[PDB]
């Protein structure tokens, strides 16, 4: 069906200037933005970000690196937007992504791999959730007949 | 100097696929993003948007059209930001644009010339007060001894 | 040797606005350009070239597909141009393509996959004899003693 | 109105890889394909062509020239595409071209400009009509409300 | 003819990733290289570059900025590449360069305009005796009789 | 950590113009540029780069080759830059390699493969000491803690 993604731009993606790439890789895809904002991330609401992981060690650092910067919060829709946009961005370590995936050409370092996204539809759902309580856009693309059916 | 300036997608421009294409020719500019984020326009706020032309014939239209699908609004800060960005965007008329613009580059017609940007920083305060009541995110670039002094 | 691959970009690629990226990857990668023809596919003519087929079920889908829309008929010639073709299209289901493939890139669906390429040798120079019946434009580029060898 | 333009890439522009840059440029504008083909001209043919010019010193130049190598005729359709197909393609000398325009980012000599267009809407529909008398392919973009009206 | 002018990327040049970007610009002009490195400018030598002005008060500081980070010299040649590469690379002040120019998509301000070319042809043959005393590399492009002649 | 490779841009890059946007890549990519230089090969020395495989058959035509046009040799730094050096090259037959990699991408034939690369660290070092004895540029990018950590 029309499955939903929260895609972050993280801050070193802000600050080396790479918000339009990555925008442009989504649009030219097919999938609709549905939710975008650029923001500062504060500690409470980090900590309720990365809340499944308020157990492990490197919480504080994911904590305070998310902090450090701005970031670009977005949701994008369309049929599995969830695992392509995991396959789109490549792998964790950006020596181990395939060329023609997001880390594969920006990152160097699995802290600094420029991007994030939902691992999974609930995942997702929870994400958005989170970061649009507000809502999302409502639009329809008139290319959707030549997308999509 | 740290003047800004509102920049905003209009609704072809975010149908039609450019919103990635027109940010990162900011950022490659060497601008900085202040704010951004996609909505749905409401017909109030579309009409004080376009007061200055209350009394034009084409009003109605304006609005009707600002409504007719959600935009990116934007706020990018930089010496100049105002005028260059005038001279990015290009002509009112596509037609009339200088090879380069933006509208030259995408747009056909003047009801659909894709992206809109403050022609005075004035009225650069007057609708970032009006699109962004809440305010600015906050950042320093790395690049920025680089782009400036 | 110099085989010769059909290549089409369906009628949802033309909407989409990617005849010009689709030639640009065929021109960069040092193939070279043998025919080309945007037209509009009568459907004797959609059932010849789907006539391979016309047995199964979904044929009728298929033949009234291609004739919905103009699409841009071309051959190209090179080195495993029909096996690299294939690969550079990627795989029928576009969340199965890999990054970088042209179906990974801008395909959602398999019924708007985008483009269509010759599967083998064989199948290739039936298709070039079907679509351009009149022959292919004779030309030597300048650049061959620097991709072959 | 919609008018039409008569669009060609000269010898020059197939040998240097332009194909898909130049395609994609029109695509980009928002103009819409009517007619593209890649061929071989014989010289009874661009006689016809620059008859205009046969009473002229350069004329037997310019006919030995379009017959060295394939070219790719296309008609392109918009709001005043002749005028601003000109404007696009650049000065006929690429050393007084604006920057932006074709010529200007991709020629250096007049004889090897890399495009032309027609000048004036009478000589588009008469290189339309003498290039394409078979007709050209309808279509309507469904992006067509967010380009026009 | 065959002329040549000396092309500098500097210091902010780098820092900001656009080497290969400017370096496209004069390849997809046709323009030929004909010669380029990487290097850090010593004191002395960047003395004898601006000699010229050296009795100017913002000598010093154009010296010094020259020093701080290293840069890419280049020879390009072609007609009118002198003339041309001022074109290209735009107006001394960003904000009043062509949008188009390098100036114009890429700097802001006039310390820091990402770029330097020989503003005369003896200039330029002062300024490549000066960089490339051991010479420069020789080669004859394929391409060279679809761009000149 | 900081380990470096020597990235060769072949002949046929040269020729064909792929200068800018193969640099483009590992700028786009997070490495460091540390050594560049535009420069004709002498036999003598080609012949001490392939070395390893003088006493293979196609090593007299594997030192003719470089010989016969300019090329652009560098060295570049970052976390894993020769191993991600390698697969962003791709498999050195460009119909094995993988799509989103350059020969993937731009090369057809084995002797016309583009680009070469050091294929292990210790000989990036074997490669650094011959091509590059007189050292390399030093510099310190300004996004580097933006980079890495």
């Given at each position: 069906?029309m499955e939903q993604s929260?895609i ?18 989504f649009?030219?895809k097919?999938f609709y ?43 994008w829709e369309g049929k599995d937007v969830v695992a392509t946009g ?32 939902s ?5 997702g ?25």
């Amino acid at each position: 069906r029309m499955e939903q993604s929260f895609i972050m731009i993280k801050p070193d993606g802000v600050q080396r200037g790479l918000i339009g790439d990555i925008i442009s890789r989504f649009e030219k895809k097919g999938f609709y933005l549905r939710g975008m904002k650029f923001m500062n991330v504060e500690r409470s609401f980090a900590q309720q970000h990365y809340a499944d992981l308020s157990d492990k060690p490197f919480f504080p650092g994911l904590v305070e690196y998310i902090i450090s910067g701005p970031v670009v919060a977005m949701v994008w829709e369309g049929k599995d937007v969830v695992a392509t946009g995991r396959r789109i961005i490549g792998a964790t370590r950006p020596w181990e992504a395939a060329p023609g995936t997001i880390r594969a050409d920006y990152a160097v370092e699995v802290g600094r791999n420029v991007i994030h996204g939902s691992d999974s539809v609930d995942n997702g759902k929870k994400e958005i959730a989170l970061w649009f309580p507000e809502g999302l856009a409502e639009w329809r693309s008139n290319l959707h007949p030549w997308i999509y059916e």
